[PDB]
């Protein structure tokens, strides 16, 4: 049996694993580029298989600067494996980026807003296509080699903190679930943590609209935005288009910014 993956790619390293999958960095032999390749073992459940096959077809249609870039998808039956070849991001994701910036000086307003705008625009792209993310969190947000923000479903398991209340309670939901996730991410970008204990305590309070007093005073506009985004009632949350048009996102600049 000839394995498509082993014939066409030189394996470099394992990047991690999560859910049905394992992810590898591998060099394509013919084109000489390095790719991220997710190998998903298809489950012994027809409805879960149905979903997986739908999801791969749906991602193959997607093209946006803030969405992870697709190359190929294929099946191998040596257990059936689905391989998905995407553009290789940097190893450190948004979660790691925030854990390496634990002071207020390292979270300058315009830098965080620039990053948040990229995420929000990726989300708005999905919503405009009648899609949603459902699982938006910092560990699902990576960077390209040139620091362009990339949203995907990375599935590297090393959390329900960013999940809307309607999902946590297992109720039906709408694209508005992603707006709830964005609210928490915006807060987290602007508010650096020293310990994981502090992070969990504070983010839990923020979910319930309890804010650190020094955050409300420093960032009054962003405070209002986060409140609205974190409404318990999904209807009350603003559309992604209304967030990206907010005044705080105009003329964003910082020393070192591209172009």
Ligand X SMILES: Cc1ccc2cc(-c3c(C)ccc(C(=O)c4c(-c5ccccc5)n(C)n(-c5ccccc5)c4=O)c3N)ccc2n1
Q: Is residue 15 involved in binding ligand X (CB under 6 A)?
A: yes
Sheet holding 34-41, edge to edge: 9-18, 21-28, 34-41, 81-87, 70-76
Among 34, 43, 49, 59, binds ligand X (CB under 6 A): 59
Interacting residues of 66 by C-beta distance below 8 A, sequence separation 6+: 118, 119, 121, 122, 125, 148, 149, 150, 151
Q: Which two tokens stand for residue 193?
A: 């943590």
Contact string 156-185 vs ligand X (x = CB under 6 A): x-----------------------------
Among 22, 38, 182, 238, binds ligand X (CB under 6 A): 38
- What's the burial of 108, exposed, middle or buried (CB within 10 Å: 0-12/13-18/19+)? middle
Among 8, 76, 108, 153, binds ligand X (CB under 6 A): 153
Q: Is residue 68 involved in binding ligand X (CB under 6 A)?
A: yes
Contact string 84-123 vs ligand X (x = CB under 6 A): x-x-xx-x--------------------------------
CA atoms within 13 A on the CB side of 124: 15
Residues in contact with ligand X by the rule CB under 6 A: 15, 23, 36-38, 40, 52, 55-56, 59, 62, 67-68, 84, 86, 88-89, 91, 142, 152-156
């Amino acid at each position: 049996y000839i394995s498509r993956y082993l014939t066409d790619f030189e394996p470099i390293q394992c990047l991690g694993r999560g859910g049905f999958g394992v992810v590898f960095e591998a060099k394509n032999k013919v084109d000489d580029c390095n790719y991220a390749i997710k190998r998903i073992r298809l489950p012994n459940r027809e409805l879960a298989r149905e979903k997986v096959m739908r999801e791969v077809k749906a991602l193959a249609k997607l093209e946006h600067p803030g969405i992870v870039r697709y190359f190929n998808a294929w099946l191998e039956a040596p257990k059936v494996y689905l391989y998905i070849q995407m553009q290789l991001c940097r190893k450190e994701n948004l979660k790691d980026w925030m854990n390496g910036r634990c002071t207020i000086e390292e979270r300058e307003r315009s830098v965080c807003l620039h990053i948040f705008l990229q995420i929000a625009e990726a989300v708005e792209f999905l919503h405009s296509k009648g899609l949603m993310h459902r699982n938006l969190k910092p560990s699902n947000i990576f960077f390209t080699m040139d620091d362009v923000v990339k949203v995907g479903d990375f599935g590297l398991v090393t959390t329900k903190l960013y999940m809307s209340p309607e999902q946590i309670h297992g109720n039906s939901y709408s694209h508005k679930v992603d707006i709830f996730s964005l609210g928490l991410i915006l807060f987290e970008l602007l508010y650096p943590f020293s310990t994981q204990m502090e992070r969990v305590r504070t983010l839990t309070d923020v979910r319930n609209l309890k804010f650190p007093p020094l955050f409300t005073q420093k960032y009054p506009c962003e405070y209002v935005m986060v409140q609205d985004m974190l409404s318990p009632s999904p209807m009350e949350r603003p559309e992604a288009i209304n967030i990206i048009e907010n005044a705080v996102f105009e003329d964003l600049d910082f020393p070192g910014k591209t172009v």
